[PDB]
Design an enzyme around this catalytic site. Structure first.
Site, PDB file in Angstrom:
ATOM      1  N   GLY B  29      40.441 -26.455 -11.517  1.00 46.67           N
ATOM      2  CA  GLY B  29      39.715 -26.428 -12.772  1.00 46.67           C
ATOM      3  C   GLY B  29      39.678 -27.762 -13.492  1.00 46.67           C
ATOM      4  O   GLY B  29      39.822 -28.815 -12.873  1.00 46.67           O
ATOM      5  N   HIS B  47      41.053 -31.221  -3.015  1.00 43.97           N
ATOM      6  CA  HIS B  47      39.664 -31.156  -3.442  1.00 43.97           C
ATOM      7  C   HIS B  47      39.314 -32.273  -4.420  1.00 43.97           C
ATOM      8  O   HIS B  47      38.308 -32.963  -4.260  1.00 43.97           O
ATOM      9  CB  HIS B  47      39.394 -29.803  -4.091  1.00 43.97           C
ATOM     10  N   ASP B  89      33.738 -29.219  -1.080  1.00 46.45           N
ATOM     11  CA  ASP B  89      33.695 -27.880  -1.646  1.00 46.45           C
ATOM     12  C   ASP B  89      33.974 -26.822  -0.592  1.00 46.45           C
ATOM     13  O   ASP B  89      34.708 -25.867  -0.845  1.00 46.45           O
ATOM     14  CB  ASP B  89      32.341 -27.634  -2.307  1.00 46.45           C
TER      15      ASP B  89
END
Lengths: 121, 121
Positions: B29, B47, B89
């Site tokens: 996040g 990521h 992703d």
């Protein structure tokens, strides 16, 4: 850095910074600026504008020193840019707290909300 | 963009992306990389490090083409950065599904100010 900012927000508002302000309205979050939805939103607008006036230091990465003595944020920082960075973060943390009473969960999003234009900081 | 990423996460994990991973641990996040709390958090760490290598495309806003064929994410984009963004992703989506077994709802809205400093990418 983000660490100080998030910690300040938590200290001032008492709310989980990511949850309440990581994706709120047009300005609270990681998606630039937009016409403020409310008071809380306006805090983040000003905050992002505050970041723009910064010269040299990285608002996201650069750590700085601040005191939370007597539950008040004091930027004791020694660097002009970092002192200014700290004051940006303190300002928004304070502003978010001051406007808790009109905070509206409706303005939270998972993806980019419909936002009108933000004017030039 | 967050749209494709979220769709990938949903497709791989079967979990609502925002709820489960919109603010998980120290790396999933908004808030930047902190020391990963667990395997799931580590996916998000990797990521974010993956994102930092991206040249000339915005991971947050930029759209890209990918297909879901035989329950496999297949990145399509002809553009090198968008392709690379797509692969970042895809990788986190797969990583998140792979570590579903140790997913911790107690981290689902982790107080990021409680996170330790992260290693450089």
């Amino acid at each position: 850095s983000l660490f100080e900012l998030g910690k300040m927000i938590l200290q001032e508002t008492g709310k989980n910074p990511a949850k309440s302000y990581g994706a709120y309205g047009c300005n609270c979050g990681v998606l630039g600026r937009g016409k403020p939805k409310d008071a809380t939103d306006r805090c983040c607008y000003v905050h992002k504008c505050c970041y723009k006036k910064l010269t040299g230091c990285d608002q996201k990465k650069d750590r700085y020193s601040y005191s939370w003595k007597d539950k008040t944020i004091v930027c004791g920082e020694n660097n002009p840019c970092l002192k200014e960075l700290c004051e940006c973060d303190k300002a928004v943390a304070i502003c978010l707290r001051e406007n808790l009473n009109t905070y509206n969960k409706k303005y939270r999003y998972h993806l980019k909300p419909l936002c009108k234009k933000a004017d030039a900081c």
